[PDB]
Structure formats: C-alpha cells, structure tokens
Amino acid sequence: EKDLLALDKWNSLWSWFDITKWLWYIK
C-alpha cells in the first residue's frame, strides 16, 4: 500500500529539503 502521506517515507525528504536550517537564522 504505497502511501504518499506515509511520514515514515518522508523522513528521507526531510534530510535534504530541511528549510528549518534556513528559518532557524530568522524565525
């Protein structure tokens, strides 16, 4: 059951698409 919202698979997108590292300097 390939889930597009399965956060268990999003963990990989959070390793390179991490903007918090960007917002941590401002927000």
From TrEMBL:
Region (MPER), start-end ranges: 6-27
Membrane topology: Single-pass type I membrane protein
Subcellular location: Virion membrane; Host cell membrane; Host endosome membrane
Protein name, per record: Transmembrane protein gp41
Gene that produces this protein: env
